[PDB]
Amino acid sequence: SMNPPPPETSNPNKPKRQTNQLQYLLRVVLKTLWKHQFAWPFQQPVDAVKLNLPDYYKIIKTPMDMGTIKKRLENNYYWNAQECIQDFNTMFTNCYIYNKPGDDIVLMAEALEKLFLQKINELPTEE
Ligand SMILES: Cc1nnc2scc(-c3ccccc3)n12
Ligand SMILES: [K+]
């Protein structure tokens, strides 16, 4: 029922890059999803106490959210685009695992995921 530590957004010994694909993931992908009318539940880790979701972190062992992704991108946490793409996919998958079809939160995730998929389709070739 309590909250875990959030995911890592800083790890100095993890090697880093700032690639054109990672820049696109910040400037295009994250910014598009972040501004969306359905972004708000996803802009920070799930607070299972405040939301009265005592089983959330029993079920979800790889939590992820756009607040974490935003910090990771702004703090150049990643080596490659795939790591960041995986974080977005983890976020959506967690929502689908925890909840049930037709829930509002699932519809919200689906709308964000649609936009994510459109933007990933247009991922630039690495320079
Ligand atoms: C995110 C999320 N993933 N599963 C659930 S059930 C309730 C929520 C939610 C709704 C509004 C604000 C914050 C979280 N979430
Ligand atoms: K489910």
Q: What is the CATH number of the domain that holds 105?
A: 1.20.920.10
Distance, C-alpha 127 to centroid of its chain: 25
Experimental technique behind these coordinates = X-ray
For residue 76, the CA-to-ligand 2 centroid distance in Å is 32
Structure tokens at 74: 């702004």
Task: Give me the domain span that covers residue 95.
Answer: 19-123
Domain-embedded: residue 1: no
Domain-embedded: residue 111: yes
Domain-embedded: residue 11: no
Q: How many domains does the chain have?
A: 1
Is residue 78 lining ligand 1, measured as CB closer than 6 Å? no
Nearest residue to 77 via CA among 35, 19, 34, 28: 19
Q: How many Å apart are CA 26 and CA 95, to the nearest integer? A: 22
Resolution (angstroms) stands at 1.2
Nearest residue to 116 via CA among 94, 84, 75, 72: 84
Nearest residue to 77 via CA among 31, 7, 5, 9: 9
Domain-embedded: residue 63: yes
Return the residue whose CA atom lies nearest to atom 4 of ligand 1. 95
